[PDB]
Each structure stands twice: as structure tokens, then as C-alpha cells.
Amino acid sequence: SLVVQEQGSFQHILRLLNTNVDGNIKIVYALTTIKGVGRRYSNLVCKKADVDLHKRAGELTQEELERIVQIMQNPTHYKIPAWFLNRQNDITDGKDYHTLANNVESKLRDDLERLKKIRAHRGIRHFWGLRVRGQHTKTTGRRRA
Amino acid sequence: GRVRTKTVKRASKALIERYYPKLTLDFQTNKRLCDEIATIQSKRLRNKIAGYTTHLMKRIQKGPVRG
Amino acid sequence: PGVSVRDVAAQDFINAYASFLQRQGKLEVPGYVDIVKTSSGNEMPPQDAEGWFYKRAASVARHIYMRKQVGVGKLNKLYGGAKSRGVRPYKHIDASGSINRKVLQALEKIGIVEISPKGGRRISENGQRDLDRIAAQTLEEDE
Amino acid sequence: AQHAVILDQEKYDRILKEVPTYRYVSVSVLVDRLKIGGSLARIALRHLEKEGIIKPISKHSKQAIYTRAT
Amino acid sequence: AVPSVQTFGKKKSATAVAHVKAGKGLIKVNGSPITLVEPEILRFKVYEPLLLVGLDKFSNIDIRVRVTGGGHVSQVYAIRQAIAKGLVAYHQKYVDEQSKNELKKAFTSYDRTLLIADSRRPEPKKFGGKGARSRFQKSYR
Amino acid sequence: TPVTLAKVIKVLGRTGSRGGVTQVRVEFLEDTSRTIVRNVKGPVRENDILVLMESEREARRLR
């Protein structure tokens, strides 16, 4: 690239999606401070909104942002494969959704209490505050209870 | 740290005991002497046997020595 | 004087092929190079993101030229690197099979590689005809 | 995430006249003066080479050594 | 059929096969010029045989080398030895012996495995620990 | 800072408990045909040279 210097376009901090973001960090790495967002789920949507990531966050004049979220809140209507998201076939409607930062803490419990209400052994496990994926528990995970 | 075994040392003295006409002060000459004058079983073995006889015969031309 | 591909440095040459092929136009990208990480063993996709297909198609040819014939599998192993299986030891695995399988078709339709007999894909003859031309163009850097 | 890791409009002036009097330079030397982070500093390095600012006695990536315009 | 020889250079596992033709001074290892091999820092390690013996000594020869086995550094050390031994091999058959005795002398005065093939070799591991001489950790109840 | 010129003429042996030291008689390259037998820490051969701070001092075998 080359050196660039805007006048006042860069804003240090600006909240969105009920989360904060440092403007002094790159925007293809800043946005991943939200829940349900990853270093890859971000990269995909970034140039899909024809935005150049080479610059930081206080950059990227608002118009883009206003619908940058719309592309993730509506990830299938806007050309993204449905094997790239955290919630496919959900649990009761067969749809494919992406849950991002407030519903994720909720949806975790949604399935969690679902297995509990169903009495599934792994629900039992969770309720006991243990390892649910079958890993040996005698010699591991001792003091963080 | 390789002190030769007395197996070779016992042999070296027993040949210098009866072959001084022969047994020049050179190893290679002495080496090809054993294949014809001795019944050794291996190159390496006769190599230290002949290589030793040489040192003994190299010193006899300086003075006498036990054995 | 008469140059050859071997007579040019690997990196500053395929990167010349990249700018050339990038600015040429006949690509036939499968359209899905927005996402693919290029291997299961890789953490994230390449950083060019407008390109890196020409950079891969740069050395995708360089290699096929220097050898008799090659196949999809061999390419996967070549670029494929070590994968940090988190807390488990690193291990090597082949790269993505389609990003290679049709990086060839995307470039054999352009005519720089032939589906060689005996199984595999040989450097095309016209691909062999643009052997030194691109090599020479890079010698023009230190003319 | 601290200490001016972006353009810094009035800092752009500082880097203009700070390049002289320097016998050494590198991406480290840039952030070493209450300045811009390495990411923006890195590509700014030869943005100076565009016209008589440095002497690139260095060779490659991960280590750079320029020198006073002669 | 012109005056030509063959020689080799052997590092730990790498073997370098060099053929020296009577030509116009061409040196292309595996088909690629010696100008740039790959280990840019280790480049001079193969350039030095030419620089040490006087650099021209090529006007009527042609060398090209292939390297199987080895590693990114095992092969670079085997080619230099292969070409040095090659040039002295040429000077044995087609030129006099003094111009050759001067070359092996100019080599051995600086030789770093240039003509005498380094005899080092990987040692085999013995059960009781992953390593040649290394042993597993002990407990002591 | 007064320094000394000391070249080891010959070596005596390894003194010290663990054997990491050794008595060594040296010669002053200044006013030669001298002594003292001082001791060292690193591995040494004959003909070596080394500086000593106080030459008016010498310790014998270490316990």
C-alpha cells in the first residue's frame, strides 16, 4: 500500500451490536471481540461488503457498517454457505441460523436445559458440572470447580 | 585406550623368538608374512599381531627387552 | 541469449506470473475462492483474497513444467503443511483437493497443461511455448 | 492497542523531520519513540524511500536497516 | 565424446553426482543455474570452491550436478565437495599434475570437508529413550 | 590498574575437591625467570597466558 492520513474520520471507540470495539486495532480482527464471531466468520463477510481490511476500525465510514451486520444477521440470503455457521437444522425448525453474542449465551442454555428436560445422560452430566464428552475425569480437571 | 591383548602379545614374542632373519621393521611386509608364516583367523587379529611384532622388532634395534 | 525457467529465481518469478496472469483475465475461478482455507491443516485462508489463485496458479505450473507429469494428490501433499491439532502434536496432511483439482482445469482450459497419458497432467506444449517468455520478462528487472 | 498505532495526523509531521540524525532505523526504532505501531510503521518504512530519505543497506523481511540520506 | 569425468560428494545422507564436460564454463545443478540454489545465506558455501582456486579455471569445462536424498543443508555441503573433487579429477587426466597438486593444495589449506568426505553419521537409538544417547526420565518412587 | 604478565611454563595437576581447578606455575613475561604457581578455573594447556590482579599473593592446594 502506501501511507495514508485522514483528518478526523477515525473514531477511537464506538459501540454496536451491544458490544465495544477498539478503533486502534484492525477491523478484520476488532470485530471478532463479539460472541459467535470468529477470525474466519468475520473475514468472509468483510470483503463481501466490498470493504478493504488493510486499515483499522475508526475507518470504514458508517454506511458499510449499517448493513455489515445485516449480512451476518441474514447470512444465507446474502450468499454464505450453510456449513460455515454455528447453528444448522437448529433443534426444532430445520433452519440454519447464526447466533451472535446475546442469543449465544442464551442458545447455549436453550440446548443445555433441553437435554436436562429430556433427561439425556449428557444433560445429567452438564447439570453435575462435569465433562460431557466422555474424557477421563479421575486425574484431570480438579481445582477449577 | 587400546592395550593389546596378551593373545597377540604372546604370539608376537613367539614369532620374533624364531623369525628375526625375516620380519623386517615394516608392518606391511610383516603383515603379508603372517598369512604365510602363521595360521591366524582374521585380518584384524593378525593386523594387531603383525603391527605389534613391528614395535617389538623396532625396539630390539635399540636394545634388549623382556621375552 | 536464451533463458529457461530454471534460470530464474522461484519467488520473484512466480510472483511475476501472478501479476501477469492476474492482469490477463482468462481465469475461470470456481467462484468460491472467498472462503477456502486451502487445507484442513490450515488455520485461516490466504491473505491476498483478490489473487492468491494466480499466485497458486503461478507455481501450479512452474512445478508441472519441471516434472514429467503430476496429479491432484501430489499437489495436495506439496503445499499441505503441519496442522497444530491443538494440544496434540503437529502432523502433516495434504492440502485441499478441489482447489487443486480445478486450479488445473481452470488453467488447462486456458491451455498450459495437458492431461498426460500414464495418469497425471503434463505441461502443455503451448504452455511450454510461454516458458521463457515469462522467464525473460523477469530478467528485464535487472536488465 | 495503545499509544497512537494509527495515522495520527499531527504525528505525520513528526516522522518527516525525525528521520535525520538517525544512524539506525527499523520497525522497532519507529515504535521506540512514543510512536506508531509496527503494523502501520512497517509499510511506512519505504514510503520514505520513494524520494531520497533512506539508504537501504538492509536485505529482507523480519529485519530492516535503512540509513541517513547521503 | 569429449574429455569428461564424473565425481561425487557425500554428506550425511545426501549424495551429489557431478559430471564435468569440456565446454564453455556452464554450471547448472539439477538443471538450474548455481547463481541461486535456495539457501541464500548458505549460497557462498558452494561459491567458495571457485573463489578459492582462482575463479576463472572454467573456460574449457562444463559442470552440472544432481542431488538425491539428504536435506535442505545436507545436499548443499555434498555438491561443493563433489565439484571440488571433480575439478581435481579433471586435472588428473587431461592436464598436468603440478596444476592439480596446486589445486588440491589450495583446497586443503582451507578445506572444510571439501575433498575428504566428512565421515560423521547418525547414531542409532537404543531402547530406553527416544534419542541416540538420551534416556527417558526416571521416577525413584 | 596494575595488571600482570603471566605465561604458564608447565602444569602441576588438578587440585580442588571436585577437580575443576588446577595448580599451575607461571612465568612473568615482565622480569622473566620468575614464578608464582597460581590456580585457574577453565581448562588449560601449556604456553598459555593470563592476567592476575594481585601478583603478591599465591594460594596452595585447595581443600
Added chain:
Amino acid sequence: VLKISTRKTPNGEGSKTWETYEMRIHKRYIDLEAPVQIVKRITQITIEPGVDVEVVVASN
């Protein structure tokens, strides 16, 4: 070189001592220019207990 690495103890006690066994195989092929009646001439006194003999036919 057919190698067999196995612990010496039948049980799993004592020092973990391993033991590698070896079996070496040698196969030699010869292409001939003989007639159609010496087919069985060097077929019987060709042997010495321990050498597996195998004769082949043309290249197709």
C-alpha cells in the same frame, strides 16, 4: 531386512528391555538364452535345500 522388535520378558516386569530380531532375504534373477529341452535340464540338480527356484516366461 525383516525386523521384529519385541520385549524380552514374557510378562511386563523388570527393566523395559526390547529385542530386535532379523531375517534377511536374497532374491536373484537371471535372464537366459537357452533351448526348449534344457527347460528341465537345469531344474533338478540346480537345488540345495533352502533356495526357492522360480523360472519365468517371455515379457508380456
Added chain:
Amino acid sequence: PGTIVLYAERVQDRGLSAVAQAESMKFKLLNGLAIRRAAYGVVRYVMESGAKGCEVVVSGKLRAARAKAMKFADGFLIHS
């Protein structure tokens, strides 16, 4: 049938090949011979039978709950 047939060939000077004598004592002790007597017999036999050296060890229990072990060897014997 016909793919194989076996022929019996007596072993030349059986008292040099160990297996022969090993089984010899087995059938000697099994017939009530004194351990020392039967063992010593095969050793003197194997020696007068040509062998440069011989050795035989008997381990286990013989009427004594504690297992003993006796060695019987004659002549020359290399081991390394």
C-alpha cells in the same frame, strides 16, 4: 497324495547333537536313575563320543520342595 513323502535317516554319532542326549536323560531320569548317575553318564558318553566339550544342567525339584540346580560339564567350552 504323492505331493510329499518322508524317509527315515539315522543320525550319525547322535552323541554330538544336543537334542539326542537331552531326550536321553529325560528317559533316563524317567526310569528312576540317580540324578548324578544319569547326568554323569551322558557327559562321559558325549565326551568319548567325540565332542570337544559338554555341559548339562538339571533344574527343578527332586523330592525336595525347594528347587535345586546342578551343573555337569567336561572338557572345553566357549561361551562368548
Added chain:
Amino acid sequence: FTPVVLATPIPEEVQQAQTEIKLFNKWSFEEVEVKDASLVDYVQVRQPIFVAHTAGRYANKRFRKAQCPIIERLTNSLMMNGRNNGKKLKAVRIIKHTLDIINVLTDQNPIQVVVDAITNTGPREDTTRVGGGGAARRQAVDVSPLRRVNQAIALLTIGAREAAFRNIKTIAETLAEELINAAKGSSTSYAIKKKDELERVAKSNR
């Protein structure tokens, strides 16, 4: 310099100084003199080598380690900590960089300020652990003419090695800034500090 050209291109950059006064990749091997009476015969320069990578057995005999190019023995003393065990190519690259520097600032050839860096980082005197009986004191000892340099090189690296930890400055710059202070030790090089304190206690026994 009587250039010679043939079929394969031999750049004039390598063609200008090969048989000319032998220099390093970019620095003269001549003019580098040990500025300490001791350490002579133990700082191998003259002979020269253009790059510090030599597959030479230096431990099959006790003292062969001394006739080894000292700058090379400095390099390999960086590829340590497991993290760098092997990696000599990464190391040697850091050295070429480090010696491109201090030259940037210090006009003096780098293979000269390097010998100046090890000369003043040798613990002329040191201490030991006398038996003494129980609560033992220390005995004033004088390091050898090669443990002197061995300790000197080890001191310099370990000091710069830790300096490069958790900080943006490159391992190359730390070693560079360590050797400049070590050229003639002045209150900052981790090496001279540890040495004088491994020496000021050598007087605590006398």
C-alpha cells in the same frame, strides 16, 4: 580486479572480491586485531571465512574448539533453548543482520568490535567453593584463556537472549546493542555487569 565471465552468469558483486583481500560477506577479515594480550592464539581470525557455517569436528579433541572461527562459535551459541536447538540457518541469518549493524553507527568493522566485545567480558578472576569445612568461603581463582572467551560469548548471548523476550525489538538489535556496549564495556551490557561482579567477589577472598 581482472574479471572473468562465462556461460552461467556470475554477478560482478561476487566477482569483485573473491581473490581480492578476503573479506566477510561484506566486511574485511584483515585489520581485525585482538586488543588484549591474552585471548591471542584463542580468537580465530586470520584465517577468514565468508559465511559462518562450517561442518568441522571441533569436539573430537579437547582444544580443537579453539582453532574454530570465533565469530562462528558465537553464532551457534544462539541456536539454543530447545526453541532454537538446530536452526543454525535462522541463527546465521541473525548474525549477518547483527553485523550489518552496529556498523550502521560504529564505523569500525563489526568483526573488530566483536573481538573488542569479548575481550572486556572475560572474568580475569572469579571465585570457587572451597571445601573449607562446612560453611565454606570462596577462593580467588583466575579463569583460563579460553573459558574466558567461552564465558564471554555465553554471557553476551544470554544477556541479549533475555532482552529480546516479550519485546518488539529484534534479537538482532539486542545482540547488536549488547556488543556495542561490550566493545568497550560501559555500564549497560549484561555481560560486563555479570563479569565484574563475578570478579568483585574474587577479592572477597584475600
Added chain:
Amino acid sequence: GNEGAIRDKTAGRRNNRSKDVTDSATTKKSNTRRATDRHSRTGKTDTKKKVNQGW
């Protein structure tokens, strides 16, 4: 059953970390009669003019 497993209290790392470990966990080898090995405990011996008949 499983409904019993959830409803039933006293389970879970909470209902368990609350307690203390039986000091028997930090126990030792309890050497298995290894200081009496050389002394036959059979309480019987082998006659001598029984072994001279056997050996």
C-alpha cells in the same frame, strides 16, 4: 432412574468439593511382606536324608 439422577441431590462437583478428602487418599505403598521374604513361612523343612536320595 435418570430423573432420579437429576432430582437426587448429593451429586455434582459442588455437593462434593464441599467435603474433604479421606486422608487415606494420600496413603503409601504399605509394603507387602517384603521384609519377611527370606524367612520361609511354610513352617516346614526338607529332611537331609531325603535330598541325598533326590540329588
Added chain:
RNA sequence: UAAUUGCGAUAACGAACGAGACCUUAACCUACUAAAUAGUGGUGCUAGCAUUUGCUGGUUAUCCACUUCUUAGAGGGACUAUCGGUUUCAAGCCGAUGGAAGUUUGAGGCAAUAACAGGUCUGUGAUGCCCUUAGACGUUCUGGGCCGCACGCGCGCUACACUGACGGAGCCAGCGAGUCUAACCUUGGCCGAGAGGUCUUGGUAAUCUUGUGAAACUCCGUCGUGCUGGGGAUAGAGCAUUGUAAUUAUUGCUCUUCAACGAGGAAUUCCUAGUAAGCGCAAGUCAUCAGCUUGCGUUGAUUACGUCCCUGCCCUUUGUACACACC
């Protein structure tokens, strides 16, 4: 001296087992024997750029020659050689030169007499005796368990990063294995982000899988010192594979969740040259499952070249009432 290995001293002289010899493997052969299942030169046939004839390839035989590389047969080679230093100038030792090699040449293999209440009746259709034997401790079938989790100990794996993680790109090994009554190793063409799917072929193998294009490593960038993009536990949701069966999630991939961990107290381990350490690979295991092991090569140090202080064990002397020998 590694060695009861020798010198030397010597009422002892001369010998054998064991150490050595020996055997195997890794290193030296332009000297012998030659090989389309190994490879080289020429030449046909053949393709690119440059022309001036060149440079870089294609070619299951187009032919011709060869054995340097490869391979494995037969030899040879080293004997610590030469010179010197040290020493009863004895065994020996040490330095230099030469040398493929001069640390038992490196690494193994084998290994005498004795000793243990060492482990193994859970390898054995090796076994003494005892127990049980038809509601069986036999045996098979169904399911569960060996994984079960307030904790204590031990062998490990991944990290705490900038000698870095990441992304392009450069891109080099070696020890192995591998399908007949068969389902083993798998190239290659497609489909698939991936995992994987699918369509054919080579191979019972120096012939095909494979130059195993392995990984660290080299290069060019993005990142910027902030738990950060270092880190990858835990966890949710989906797609695959193994398999009669994957729930307590066999393994693989994808997205998301993003712990502790900012170099580790007292303590203790392994190790001296291609070794340590970093790196991945094959093999055992194996339907699926390596954070295990056994081998391999890859990149390649520091500091020793010494002592008996610590620790352990030998050997004398010595006491002994022990000899079932200090249990």
C-alpha cells in the same frame, strides 16, 4: 587399560572360560565381477526460448557404449601408522602430519561362575498340589464395567510467543510395509469448503502406491506487544468416516465458545559429537482409535576432555559368636 587389559615386580612357571578375539550394522574403494526391477554418456525420435553451433525438458526400450552415482558379491584397507612428546623412557599415554577412518574406529550383538524365596501358574495342550465342576470358577449369549471422580503420586502431549503465530511461496530425507481365494498398499479423472465421495489402474513389489515434494527449515508479506492474531482446555450446533453397534460423545472436517497459562517453590531427570535438543516419518498396535513404544532420517549446539565432594557400586584391609550368613 573400557577390561584379572597389560607392563613391571615376583615362589611361582606356563594355560583355558569370561574381557579380547568374534559376529552384525554404519562409514573407504573411478581396482574385480554388471544389472529396462539401478543408473550414466551418445544417438535416434521429440518440445520451448534464443539464435551462431546453444540452454531446459519429453521419449516402458529407438538403438549404442559404460558401472562414477545405485545395488551386493569377492577382495583389499587400520595395525593407533609415521614422526615427535611423556613415562621404570616398560605397558602405555599425549601432540602433530598422513589418513575413509586413529574415543574398544562409531553403534550394537553375544557374554563365564554365582547369587534373588525378583516378576511370570493372566502366553503356553509347560506343570506339582489345592479349589470348583451342571443353580459351574467350564462355556457361550445379552447388557453393563475396566474410562466410573472431593483428591495424592508418576511417564507424557500443547503452550505461555516477535530466534513468534499466521498467510503465500520456496521445498529436502531415511528405516519400513503392503491384496488369494482377495478386499492390502493405492497413483490417476471427476464431484465435494472440508472431511470425504466416486470412477479405473499399477503392484505378491528395488518393477506400482513413492523423489513417500514429511516436518521443522528457507523466502515475502499481514500482525505490534496489549492474554494480543500467543494459547487451545471446555462447550454448543452440523457434515463425514470405522464398524452388527459409536449414547458415557471411536476418529476426521466445519462454524462458533476462547479457560488456565506472562518461564514455574522445595526438589529431581537425560546427556559429551552428528551427540544434546528441536523436527517430522515408518513400523509395532490396528475394523476404527498414538499424546505410547520401536527404528529412521531431517536441522544441529553449549560445555566437558576433569575429580571422589555428593551419590552408588566395586576392591583391599579388618572385626565377627553370623554360615538359614545382619531379613
